[PDB]
Structures are given as C-alpha cells and as structure tokens.
Amino acid sequence: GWTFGAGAALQIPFAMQMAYRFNGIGVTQNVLYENQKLIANQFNSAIGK
C-alpha cells in the first residue's frame, strides 16, 4: 500500500487496499465490492491500448 514509505512494510490484500483508496474521493465501499469484475475488466482493457 503506502505504508512502506513511512516505516516498515505491512501486508494487505489488494481488494481491500482498493477500497481504502476508493473511500478517499467520496464514494463508499459497497460500490466497489459489488462491481469488482467490471472494474477489473475495465482496467485490463485500458492497459493495453
């Protein structure tokens, strides 16, 4: 995540780190937790153009 630049590295799964970041712009967490597949597909298609 972002804890390796301010101390010691601490592990965390990816799908929860994305919710952590997603909470910082206004939208809540269930929006991400209910649309994981669509977001993964969009990201995968975006990187490749």
């Binding site: 929860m16 269930n30 937790y33 209910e34 994981q36």
Partner: protein, 64 residues
C-alpha cells in the same frame, strides 16, 4: 460478515480475528472492540460479496 441474511460493512475500521472470535479495530492502532449495530451499516443481501463470513451481531438496546 453475514447475519440474519444480510450484509454488514464497517463504518471506520477493519474486521480482525484472533482465531476464534471477531472484533473491530481502527487501522492505525490495536484496540479491539465487540461488534454491535452502532458501528456497522447494512446494504443488500448475502450473495454479491466475495469472502463473506458468518457471525452474530449484538443488538444493544431492544434485547436488553
């Protein structure tokens, strides 16, 4: 977590367990607490999230 056929998400913090019990704590310090309905909100049903577990959610007032 999933209780009574519903999905409960945390308000501020994470879900942690010591092996046989579940708690709620802040993300930057270790201070365990018991799960009630005053620090979670419910949205949807129990078939959309991946990794849902089972437990019981304490109701603080009505059954007391």
């Amino acid at each position: 977590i999933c209780h009574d056929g519903k999905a409960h998400f945390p308000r501020e913090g994470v879900f942690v367990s010591n092996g046989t019990h579940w708690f709620v704590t802040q993300r930057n310090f270790y201070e365990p607490q018991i799960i009630t309905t005053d620090n979670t909100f419910v949205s949807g049903n129990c078939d959309v999230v991946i990794g849902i577990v089972n437990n019981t959610v304490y109701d603080p007032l009505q059954p007391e």
